[PDB]
Amino acid sequence: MVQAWYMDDAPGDPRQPHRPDPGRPVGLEQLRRLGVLYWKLDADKYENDPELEKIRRERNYSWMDIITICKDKLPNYEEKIKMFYEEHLHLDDEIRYILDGSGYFDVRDKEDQWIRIFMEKGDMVTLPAGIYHRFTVDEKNYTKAMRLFVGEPVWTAYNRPADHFEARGQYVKFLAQT
Numbered sequence: 001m002v003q004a005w006y007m008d009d010a011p012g013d014p015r016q017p018h019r020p021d022p023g024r025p026v027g028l029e030q031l032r033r034l035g036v037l038y039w040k041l042d043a044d045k046y047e048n049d050p051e052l053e054k055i056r057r058e059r060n061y062s063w064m065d066i067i068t069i070c071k072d073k074l075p076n077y078e079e080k081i082k083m084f085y086e087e088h089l090h091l092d093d094e095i096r097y098i099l100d101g102s103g104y105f106d107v108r109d110k111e112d113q114w115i116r117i118f119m120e121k122g123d124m125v126t127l128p129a130g131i132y133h134r135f136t137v138d139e140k141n142y143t144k145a146m147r148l149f150v151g152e153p154v155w156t157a158y159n160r161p162a163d164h165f166e167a168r169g170q171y172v173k174f175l176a177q178t
């Protein structure tokens with residue numbers, strides 16, 4: 001299924017699991033109900049994978065490239081790192097397919113609590129426009145992720161608070177409107 005839990009309030013290293021024992025799991029249905037989508041895919045065949053190309057069609061993901069997140073490959077690693085884990089939203093959907101390595105994507109639930117989602121090689125997610133999230137690598141310190149977008153991309157992150165944007169209002173309507 002998926003590896004996801006309500007993460008702890010603990011401060012300290014973000015790249016740690018922040019996964020309390022005992023703790024409450026999180027499933028697919030719950031994430032779906034938050035507008036979040038998920039897929040498992042053959043990460044070796046990505047360069048010519050029908051399933052990937054089917055999803056892209058169905059979702060008009062016309063745009064794609066790859067980011068390799070690690071100290072020696074990504075320029076301004078430490079700054080970029082800090083930016084990702086800042087809580088923010090987007091005015092469009094955020095689509096990552098992890099091709100290699102792994103990391104965590106946290107989102108807030110219907111009661112504004114942090115959910116942590118562990119993403120591995122082969123895992124793909126979509127975080128709907130308007131959802132407050134953040135991202136961090138785990139202690140392996142490496143994530144390679146195909147980024148996807150509907151047409152030409154706009155990367156802008158608006159940190160929290162950003163509750164005035166229409167995308168934010170639309171998403172919060174969507175939650176109440178189940």
Ligand code: MET
Nearest residue numbers: 083084094133134135157
């Ligand atoms: C340069 S901030 C980019 C935000 C990105 N979608 C993330 O959640 O990590």
Ligand SMILES: [Cl-]
Nearest residue numbers: 067084147155
């Ligand atoms: Cl990014």
Ligand SMILES: [Cl-]
Nearest residue numbers: 075076077078
């Ligand atoms: Cl650097």
Ligand SMILES: [Fe+3]
Nearest residue numbers: 090094133157
């Ligand atoms: Fe983001």
